[PDB]
Symmetry: D2
Subunit: 299 residues, 4 copies
Amino acid sequence: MNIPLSGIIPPLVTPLLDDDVLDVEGLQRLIEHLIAGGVHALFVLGTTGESQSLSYKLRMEMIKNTCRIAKGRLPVLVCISDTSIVESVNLACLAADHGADAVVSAPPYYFATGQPELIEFYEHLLPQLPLPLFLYNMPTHTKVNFAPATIQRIAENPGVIGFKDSSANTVYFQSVMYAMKDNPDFSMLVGPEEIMAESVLLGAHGGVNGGANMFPELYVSLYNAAKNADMEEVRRLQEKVMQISATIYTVGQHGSSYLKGLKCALSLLGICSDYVAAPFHKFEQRERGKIWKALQNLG
Amino acid sequence: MNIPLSGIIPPLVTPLLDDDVLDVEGLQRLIEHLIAGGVHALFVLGTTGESQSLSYKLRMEMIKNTCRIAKGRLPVLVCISDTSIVESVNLACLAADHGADAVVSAPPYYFATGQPELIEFYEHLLPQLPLPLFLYNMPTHTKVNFAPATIQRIAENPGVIGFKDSSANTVYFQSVMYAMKDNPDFSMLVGPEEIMAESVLLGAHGGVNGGANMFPELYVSLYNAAKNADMEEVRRLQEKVMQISATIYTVGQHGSSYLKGLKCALSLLGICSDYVAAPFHKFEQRERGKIWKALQNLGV
Amino acid sequence: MNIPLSGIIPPLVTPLLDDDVLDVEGLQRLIEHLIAGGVHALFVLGTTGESQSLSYKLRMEMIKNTCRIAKGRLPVLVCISDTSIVESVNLACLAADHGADAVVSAPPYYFATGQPELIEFYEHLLPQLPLPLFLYNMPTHTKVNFAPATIQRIAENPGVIGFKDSSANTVYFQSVMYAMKDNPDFSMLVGPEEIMAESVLLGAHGGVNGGANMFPELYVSLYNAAKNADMEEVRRLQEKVMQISATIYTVGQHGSSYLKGLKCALSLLGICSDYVAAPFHKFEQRERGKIWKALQNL
Amino acid sequence: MNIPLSGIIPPLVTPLLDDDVLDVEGLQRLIEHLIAGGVHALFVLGTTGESQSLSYKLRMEMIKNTCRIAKGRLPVLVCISDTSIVESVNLACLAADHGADAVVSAPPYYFATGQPELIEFYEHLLPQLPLPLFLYNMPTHTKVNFAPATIQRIAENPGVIGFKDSSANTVYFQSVMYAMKDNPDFSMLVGPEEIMAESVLLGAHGGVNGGANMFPELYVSLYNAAKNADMEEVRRLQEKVMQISATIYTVGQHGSSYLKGLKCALSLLGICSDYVAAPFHKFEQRERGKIWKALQNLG
Ligand code: NA
């Protein structure tokens, strides 16, 4: 792993044949498509990867297979978030055993607590982990953000090397950048792709952007444009990312519109299965048709 | 397994010697204490049982040990809620194999947009279950409740036999009571013990009350007084229940003060280990001191 | 003014002829209907009264007319809640000048982050008020409820005589009842009519029940049956209340289904105008016809 | 007045001598300070102006004095949001009679169920207003945003000329930019100052930034550097903005710390009274001491 991890780091979907069956052939296709597209690392079992909805055995298979297929060509980050900390540590050990480079952890959804309790949780977790850690802020779930100073503090431990934000809240994100400005080796990553460009312009290291599963070259181009402040390219490419956001992710009449749209598009592009794990369901033909048309209108 | 299941149905704590180690001897003492205290069933892996936060292995051990120790003396209800439907169904099958009488299920936190999907979720789930099911309304995470009409509809399935609510919202609970009033065999249970008495007075079948881990006799006596509308006795005992609620469940400074306080008291009562699994930080001395004091004020 | 205030205390709708015009004749009829139905006090400018949606002028007119019409026959409670403390104290002073007996206040949404601030809010407001005060827990907006210990502490002031909860959370309500049980002059009132009976059974003093605008005698009868633990009557009458709840309050597709249903019924019953103030609007005929039908089926 | 309204548009504090008494002399000093500082408009009775917590009388005095003092030198925008539509329309008419240029409106917190109802709210409001309107997305209360398509739709009305976002969610803001990209005349403004630079870089028209009460030149300079993509200067000035945010707005033990700090700083700077209306109260000696230290550490 490069210090600081930078660039586009797609959160892989977990392609499925069935609720409890990994689509290994499509995983292979996806990973080659990403690598050939110039992405900088692979991120497995994120939200985009349906981690929580999958069985334990299937999560282990996604890790093992991703590590096998990638064959050291790129760093692999494994999201170890789990309601059970024991199970979280076990995923971390699996990851180390199969050659992953780092783990990624958000506190459990039910862990609505104060900051001192967040700090103590991580202080007790870190000794148990065999790989460097990225902290994962996904606020909806806890109703509690890592406070900037809390990130400062946990980032003292040399086993903590970065931070991924999936708040779309950029006031919060800039507050953490400011708090971390004297530790420039600490990787500051942004989840939502719609704000990757503007965040990178202001010094964010990279984007953990789900749309890069589809069009890795687009997101890598936009990242580089933003990095070098080529403003005409930033504007032209941002409009494409935004068209995708408005057209590929908004078809659901039943929830998880982003995940269903992404997975449908991946199947339409011939990359991997669009099977979505229960209790959710893949797009049927009407919605799928809309995703087809949206895809043709991007070009 | 009485239809409708009624009375006091404690949500057992899952006693732990360590994050991943079941306190078997403490579980045995707890169960005997509950049985001798007159409760009508045992409910495992509820919120009180920390189910989300335990490993798969430990959840299974809780189920297996509880069924073994109960020895058929009381119905055992197993909460099978999980973020993964496959793990959920596995837990149900494990429960059936080990002699449990029913399962209890809430849809996963991240799930229900609306009512028609709630209906579908259960329509898909039911054919996979080997035991009768109680629906569990736990709206804290997923802002959407089961609408009254939704419960009516799901309850038509002969494999759905009741409903447990842990909203403390009794306007909602009364709305479901009215919707289900022509199905007197469908068990309507209330979680929070502070509203058990008033709900049973108005026809609820029982209370899934955590305090009964500590003092099963108090909740059983209150349930019976409510059932019989012995108002003097209802008021006398309701005060003790509220005292326990104000002094045992409020120490943490966190929403999870209830669990930490309850397990702390159970250890101070000699029943089982007080240990709460990570991620939760243990009570330090000042907090344990308040629990000890609250218990001394109740004559322990 | 009976201490503790008890029984049925309807939150009067504010009857309107237009967005900024009071329906005075309807208000007169409503008050006569409530008094004849045996209610024990009148509560104006509650959420049932559309307070926040009305102009200052119309809030003042409702206070003035309600007091004139009641002519001392029943205690009048006025909700003074407002985002401006100055405006809230102005409503309190007007209420006093026109013969109201008490004021009712919730802290504004934006203010409450903690218990110490709620204490300080009331410590600062109380010396400005010319009438006794009921505290109330703002139903939706706020993140922060009055903690039971905070209510104990605020009620150390003799100018604080009660608490009304519009949360439908009876665990919370029981926690407050328990903290206040040893103050015999302190009135504990429950807003939502669906839980009035069970709460009175366990010692609540009364109900601030919107349905009593339509059928005051029914809610009074249920209150007395609960108060006296006549369980057969409690059950019989609770079922009628729940039927109202299921059928009169559930017709709206657009929000504020309770208020639009209630006002629609009041007009169909011949009591007062159904007009609802902008930005909301009264039911049009498709929905009104359903309320009519539901009424015919009680 | 200028279409689209652009630049720095400070949400003025409402300077007070007491809970219900306007500090007229402070307000004059404040407005002269903003004008000389190069701002492009004045926005009165926003959140920063404490509108909700002030009496109707005081809100009217703020409007009247602000228009009198500005003397046509700069557009005046007036927040007319109120739980009562009758009261809101009355403030708009008062604004018009005193020569304000536009009104700013959010729907009342309780109201919005859905998008169709937001549209109808504005359809009924618009014929009643005597000035052009800016829509604004209420930061905390509503729990239902203007969807992008909703903004497109309301913006067809010639009486609606802009949009101000205070949410701090830049995924959402970029979604609305994308929806409004074919109507360049429609003014798109961001409230929170910490993300003004990044939003302007990507084409936002302006910043309704409270910190501009204290240091108008700094925010105008940052706006211009973002506008022209002068990146070295964006970085230099963003660091100062983030220092103000970290050190002036964080002294309270409260959510109120932004307002108390801003007003304390304004007083220490000789501009206007620091008085804060009940139920809040201005910083006493200790906190005031900390704010002064913070100010000396900026410069
Ligand atoms: Na059934």
